[PDB]
Design a protein around this nucleic acid. Structure first.
Ligand SMILES: [K+]
Ligand SMILES: [Mg+2]
Ligand SMILES: [Mg+2]
Length: 98
RNA sequence: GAUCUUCGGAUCACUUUGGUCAAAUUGAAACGAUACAGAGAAGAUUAGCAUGGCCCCUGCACAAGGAUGACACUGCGACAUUGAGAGAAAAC
């Protein structure tokens, strides 16, 4: 059944994936791009577990009056994958248009 | 110096310099000519009025003229891709 349920997910989206307006196109493009995302590397879990042991005050997930979220400077790999993803999307657009 | 005053002094008047810049090749403009093309509307000849502004010229002009003054008048991708097949690859 599990294989059929996987096919049920396929057919449900296949009839749901088959231009109307910009408002709906926004969400469709966004989650289509999300489908190509590969999250959850070794950075996030270490960040969650390490400074929480010495969390004297405020939480790492607290954002009511946090200040360090202004100065989040990412690493090389993340911005590299960003440029590569945007380049791939541009390639897809230019191969689709003509 | 003039006036008094009494030979102590008092009156009267009191600070310039119009500077596109020191006697003209090298800090007031704008070009002649020769050589090239060489006069708007989808055949041909040709009326014009406009639109745009780091383009102006003549004019006292918010008239009007200067070739309808001249130049300009186009053109592209917030396209989602799936619709499918095939050989591969890694995968139903
Ligand atoms: K004419
Ligand atoms: Mg005129
Ligand atoms: Mg004109």
């Amino acid at each position: 059944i599990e294989e059929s349920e996987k096919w049920d997910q396929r057919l449900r989206k296949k009839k749901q994936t088959i231009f109307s307006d910009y408002h709906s196109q926004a969400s469709k493009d966004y989650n289509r791009g999300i489908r190509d995302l590969k999250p959850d590397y070794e950075k996030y879990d270490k960040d969650k577990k390490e400074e929480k042991s010495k969390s004297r005050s405020v939480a790492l997930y607290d954002e009511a009056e946090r200040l360090d979220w202004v100065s989040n400077k990412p690493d090389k790999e993340h911005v590299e994958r960003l440029v590569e993803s945007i380049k791939k999307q541009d390639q897809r657009r230019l191969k689709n248009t003509k």
